[PDB]
Design a protein around this ligand. Structure first.
Ligand SMILES: *[C@@H]1O[C@H](CO)[C@@H](O[C@@H]2O[C@H](CO)[C@@H](O[C@@H]3O[C@H](CO)[C@@H](O)[C@H](O)[C@@H]3O)[C@H](O)[C@H]2NC(C)=O)[C@H](O)[C@H]1NC(C)=O
Ligand SMILES: *[C@@H]1O[C@H](CO)[C@@H](O[C@@H]2O[C@H](CO)[C@@H](O[C@@H]3O[C@H](CO)[C@@H](O)[C@H](O)[C@@H]3O)[C@H](O)[C@H]2NC(C)=O)[C@H](O)[C@H]1NC(C)=O
Lengths: 122, 122
């Protein structure tokens, strides 16, 4: 199904942003649409979105972050990141937030501006 | 099922906040938990949460707002509000946001601070 201007794929709907924003701003944005940032299901899904976002270049925020007090990478669903379901690359001496480039997954400052993608589940 | 410190009810899990915040801050908060603000299902559900939040008093933000350029009340899922599935009370000369008190549902400035509740669906 999905709504107008969102792209369907398996049991999920995606909306790619038209602007770039901080990680926390992107949380508020997908929140106002009754959605969340991305919980990556497969390397298949990561392929599909990498294509969809090819034209935009940029690298898009996902629902995955590192808070220094936790001492670990965590998806917004509460699960710890599996390092070889998905391999994040970059430093972690501060709170960081993950984005997905064409070739990598990046630890970045949560105050960087990136494109984001929102998901809703059918 | 649900996770630790969330309350189950029908097919939904709820978490009540421990602080009070603006509407947009609450969007970011439930976003970081892979959740959304409340989409009220029944007057049954509004009863259950009004009890759960009885001890906090206060009035909790929900996933419903009015943006002046739209000219109508809309849930975060995109649907327009049915005024007698749920009746909102208060003015609308500016963008507003809805909270649920013990007796009413209130139009408020989106910059007010309220308690909020996040929902995940099983
Ligand atoms: C929190 O979100 C993360 C990211 O979506 C979830 O991680 C994903 O969990 C699924 C389901 O358990 C994993 O899929 C599995 O793949 C193997 C095939 O190799 C198969 O044996 C299983 O039947 C299943 O399909 C998936 O790999 C995994 N993705 C990543 C990137 O780690 C996590 O489950 C979520 N937490 C929940 C739903 O509580
Ligand atoms: C967007 O969210 C709102 C708030 O959750 C949804 O409104 C709710 O929609 C449901 C399902 O259509 C309504 O329930 C219906 O109740 C009558 C009994 O009077 C029954 O005939 C139907 O079988 C159904 O159970 C519910 O009243 C309604 N709640 C409110 C407060 O309006 C709306 O559906 C959501 N949009 C979606 C899912 O796209």
């Amino acid at each position: 199904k999905c709504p107008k201007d969102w792209h369907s794929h398996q049991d999920k709907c995606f909306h790619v942003s038209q602007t770039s924003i901080t990680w926390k701003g992107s949380l508020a944005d997908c929140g106002g649409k009754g959605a969340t940032l991305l919980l990556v299901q497969d390397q298949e899904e990561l392929r599909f979105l990498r294509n969809l976002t090819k034209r935009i270049s940029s690298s898009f925020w996902i629902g995955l972050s590192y808070t220094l007090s936790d001492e670990k990478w965590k998806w917004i669903n509460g699960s710890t990141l599996n390092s070889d379901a998905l391999n994040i690359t970059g430093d972690t001496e501060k709170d960081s937030c993950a984005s997905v480039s064409q070739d990598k997954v990046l630890s970045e400052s949560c105050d960087s501006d990136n494109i984001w993608i929102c998901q809703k589940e059918l």
